[PDB]
Subunit: 122 residues, 4 copies
C-alpha cells in the first residue's frame, strides 16, 4: 500500500497530513495542525508495515511531528500510531500521544492522548 | 541536546534503542526489543525539539518502529512519545502506543499503551 | 446534569451503558459489551462532576467495569474517562483503558487503549 | 485478594489511595493527590476482579475520582486502570486518563495520560 498511503490526508479537525510512503517502509512529509500552538507545516517522519497481511487486516503505521519550525516552537512532539484501511473510503485510524517538555514537578501532566481519523477528502 | 540524545539507550525490559540526533531535529537509528514478536534490529525514525526551553524543562521527542525486518513481520508499529532529561542520570521518559493491523471487527482491540524509561546504563 | 446523564446510552460498537447519576457525584449501573470476552450485563461504578462550569464546557466523568459476572470472567477491567456534552444530540465522548491481569513477563502488553462515543440513540 | 487490596496505598508522587475491596468486586474509598488542582480527600469508586486467575497473574482493577470536593472543583475526572500484584512488595501498577470538561474547540486537548505505581510503604 505504498500507492494507497502516499498523498494528502485530512483529519476531523481540518489538519493536513502530506506523506510519501517509501518501498522500504519509510514515511516522510509534512503536517499542518488546524489547532493548538502551530502555524504552517512541520516535518514528519515515520514507518509503516510495507508487507501487510492479505486477510483484510489494516496496515500498521506511525509517525512523529516535533512542533518546531521557522515560525514557532511549542516544545512538544506528537506521535500518531494507527492503521491504514484501503478501499473506496480509505482511512487512517490513529491514536496519538502529545508530550511537552516539562520540569520534573510538572512531568505527571506532560502527555495528552487523543484520536484522529484521516480521510482523502475534506 | 544533539550530543545528549545521540547514543545507545536501554529500557527497563532490556530493549536497546540506538539513535542519532540530527542538527535539524531528525532521529534515526535502530531498535531491538527484548520482548514480543521481535528479533534483532528494526529501523526507527523520529523527531525531537532541537531548540528546547532553557528553564530546566525536558526536551520533547518521539519515534516510530514498524515491526518488520528481514527476520519477522509482526504487522504492527510502536510510537514512543516522551522527553529527554539531561544530567548525571540522563533519562528518556516515554509513553508508547503499539498498533496492530486488524480486521474492522477487531479494531477496537488494535492498540496497546504502555510506558518505557530509557537510561544510558544497563 | 444528573437528568442529562441518567439513562441508557449506546456506543459505536452497539454496546449498552445503563447509568444513574446521583446528586452526590456517583455513577452506578450496568454495561453490556457488543464485543470481546463478554456476555450480558456487568456492574459499573464511577464518578462525575456534579457542579460543572457554566461556560459551555462539558461535564467530566469516568467509570469502571470489571469483566466478571455470573456467566464469564475475562480477568480484566476497563475504565472510561470522558466528558458529557448536553443538548439536542447529547454525547459522552470517552477514551478508555482495558487492563488484563498478566504475569510479570507479559505486563508490558497488559493494557489496551481506545475511544468510545456514546449517544442516546441506536 | 479482598485482604490484599484493602488498605492505604501510596504512589511515586506521594499521593494517598485509601480503598476497601468488597467481596462483590466493589472498590470504595478516598484519594488525596500530592499534585495538581487538588486539596484534601476526594471520593473514589471502582471495581476489581474478585476471582482472579491462579496462574500467578495479577488482579485487574480500576477506579475513578471526580476532582470535586467541599474545597475545590477542578472540573475533571481521573480513571486508573491496572493490576494488583501480591506478595512481599505488593504493588498496584496503573495507567490513568485525566479528562477535563472543555469547550468543543478545546476537546482535542481534554485528556492527559500517565502511569502511577502504588505501594503499601511511603
Amino acid at each position: 500500500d505504498e500507492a494507497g498511503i502516499t498523498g494528502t490526508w485530512y483529519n476531523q479537525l481540518g489538519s493536513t497530513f502530506i506523506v510519501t510512503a517509501g518501498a522500504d517502509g519509510a514515511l516522510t512529509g509534512t503536517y499542518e495542525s488546524a489547532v493548538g500552538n502551530a502555524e504552517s507545516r512541520y516535518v514528519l517522519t515515520g514507518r509503516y508495515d510495507s508487507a501487510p497481511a492479505t486477510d483484510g487486516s489494516g496496515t500498521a503505521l506511525g509517525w512523529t511531528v516535533a512542533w518546531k519550525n521557522n515560525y514557532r516552537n511549542a516544545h512538544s512532539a506528537t506521535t500518531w500510531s494507527g492503521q491504514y484501511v484501503g478501499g473506496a473510503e480509505a482511512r487512517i485510524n490513529t491514536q496519538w500521544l502529545l508530550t511537552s517538555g516539562t520540569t520534573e514537578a510538572n512531568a505527571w501532566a506532560s502527555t495528552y492522548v487523543g484520536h484522529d481519523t484521516f480521510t482523502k477528502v475534506k
